[PDB]
Write a protein that binds this ligand. Sequence first.
Ligand SMILES: Oc1ccc(-c2cocc2-c2ccc(O)cc2Cl)c(Cl)c1
Ligand SMILES: Oc1ccc(-c2cocc2-c2ccc(O)cc2Cl)c(Cl)c1
Lengths: 229, 232, 10, 9
Amino acid sequence: NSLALSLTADQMVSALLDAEPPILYSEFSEASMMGLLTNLADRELVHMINWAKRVPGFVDLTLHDQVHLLECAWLEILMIGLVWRSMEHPGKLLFAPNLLLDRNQGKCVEGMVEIFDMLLATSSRFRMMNLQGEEFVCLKSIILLNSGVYTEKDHIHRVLDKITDTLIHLMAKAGLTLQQQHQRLAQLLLILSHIRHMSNKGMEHLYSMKCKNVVPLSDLLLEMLDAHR
Amino acid sequence: LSLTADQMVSALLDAEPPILYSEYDPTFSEASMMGLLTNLADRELVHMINWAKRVPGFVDLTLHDQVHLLECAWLEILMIGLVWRSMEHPGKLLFAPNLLLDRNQGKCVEGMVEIFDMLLATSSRFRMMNLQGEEFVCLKSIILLNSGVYTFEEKDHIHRVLDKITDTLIHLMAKAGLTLQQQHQRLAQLLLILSHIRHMSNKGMEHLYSMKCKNVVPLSDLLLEMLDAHRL
Amino acid sequence: HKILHRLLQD
Amino acid sequence: KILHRLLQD
Ligand SMILES: Oc1ccc(-c2cocc2-c2ccc(O)cc2Cl)c(Cl)c1
Ligand SMILES: Oc1ccc(-c2cocc2-c2ccc(O)cc2Cl)c(Cl)c1
C-alpha cells in the first residue's frame, strides 16, 4: 500500500502541476471588500478540495485524516496561492485577475491591513528568492501534509520525505551546487513558518468578522473556521 | 560567517542557558500552578536574552532588530526548550526538574490542555526522530533569526547567518553517517517542526492574552511587555 | 455533518 | 521597555 512512493521526481512534479486549481474571478467599503473576498475564498476552497485528492498519497489517507489536514491548513494553502499569484505584482495582492489591491486599499477593513503586509512581504520574499512554479506546488503540498500531522501516520512523513526529494531534484536540475541545494531548501521551508503565522493571524481576523456579523459568511467557511477552537 | 561548523556548534552549546527550577511543593490548583509557570517562564526569559547575545551574528544587528526578533520568537524558544527537556519523559512536560506535568494536570487551567497536547506531540516527534543536542541548539538559533525576519533593510545579512547554520546541520548529519538524501530529508523534517512550533506560539500567546484579561493571576512586567508585541 | 465530508466524496 | 535595557546590559 504505497502508490505515491513508487513515483519518480518527474512524475511527482507533473502530478502536482496537472492537479493545480484554476485562477477564479470576482464580480470599496469594509462590507463591500470583505464580501467579495469571502465570496472568492468560498469558491477557491471547493477547487482546493479537488486539488487535495489529486495529490499523491492524500487519497491513501482515511476520510477523517483528510478532513483533519484540510481543516488545519486550508488558510495557509489559500494564502501561499494568493502570495504566489501576486508574486510579480510588487506591493499588490492578486486575489483575482480583475481584483488587484494595495496596502492602503486594505485599510478599509481594519485588522486586515496587518495581514496585507505579511502577504506582501511573502510574495516579495518569493519574488526575491525567484520561486519556481515546480518548487511552489511542492511547498503547497508540504503544507497540506505537514500542517496538522502532529495534531500509520508514518506514511505521511514518507510522502513528505519524497516531496522533499522533488525539491532537491528540482534544484539539482537548475544547476545549484550541493551546498546551495540544501540552503535553498532551508529558505523555502522557513517561509512555511511565516505562512503558518499568517494563517493564525488571518484565522483570528475571520473569527472577528464572524462575531461582528458585519459580513455574512458562508457556512462552509464557518465549519472550516470553528474547527480552530 | 568566519566560523567553521565545529565552532558554530560549540558556540551554540557554550551559549546554552541552565534549566532552572520552580517553587513547587506538593502542598495546588489552577492558580500559582499557572503562576509558577509564569514565574518560571519569566526567569528563563532573562537567561534567553543573555543567550541571544552569545548567538553568532546576533550582536552585529541593531538594538531595534534585537528587540524585534525576540518579541516575535520569545515563546517559540521557550517552547522548543520545554520540548527538548521533556524529551525523555513521554506523556509528560518537564517545565523544571522538580516540576513535571502531564495532560490531565494541564486541564486545571482551561484551554491550556490544548497547548499541553501539542507540546507533548512535539516532544513525541523529537523522540521519534531521535533529535540530538547539536541539532537542537541550531534550531534554537534558527527560530531566533527567522521568526521575525519579514515582520520588519541591509539586514539580509541575517539570511547569510541562517545559511551558515544550515551548513552546520548538514555537516552534523553528514557526521552521523547519513547519506546526502538522508541529510536532506532530515533537514526538511527538522525545519517542518518549526512550522508547528510557530503555530504553538501563536496559539500559546493567544492564551496568555486570555489570562491577561482574566486577572486571576498577574504576570511578570517583562512578560506583559513581551506579550504587547503580538497584540500590536 | 460537515460539508467537507460531502466534497471529499463527490 | 524592559527588554531594551537588558539587551544593552
Ligand atoms: O481567495 C482568497 C480570498 C481571500 C483571502 C484572504 C487573504 O487574507 C484574508 C483573506 C480572506 C478574507 C475574507 C475571507 O472571508 C476569507 C479570507 Cl481567506 C485569500 Cl488568501 C484567498
Ligand atoms: O519555562 C516555561 C514555562 C512555561 C511555559 C509555557 C508553555 O506553555 C505556556 C507556558 C506559559 C504559561 C504561563 C505563562 O505565564 C507563560 C508561559 Cl510561556 C514555557 Cl514554554 C516555558
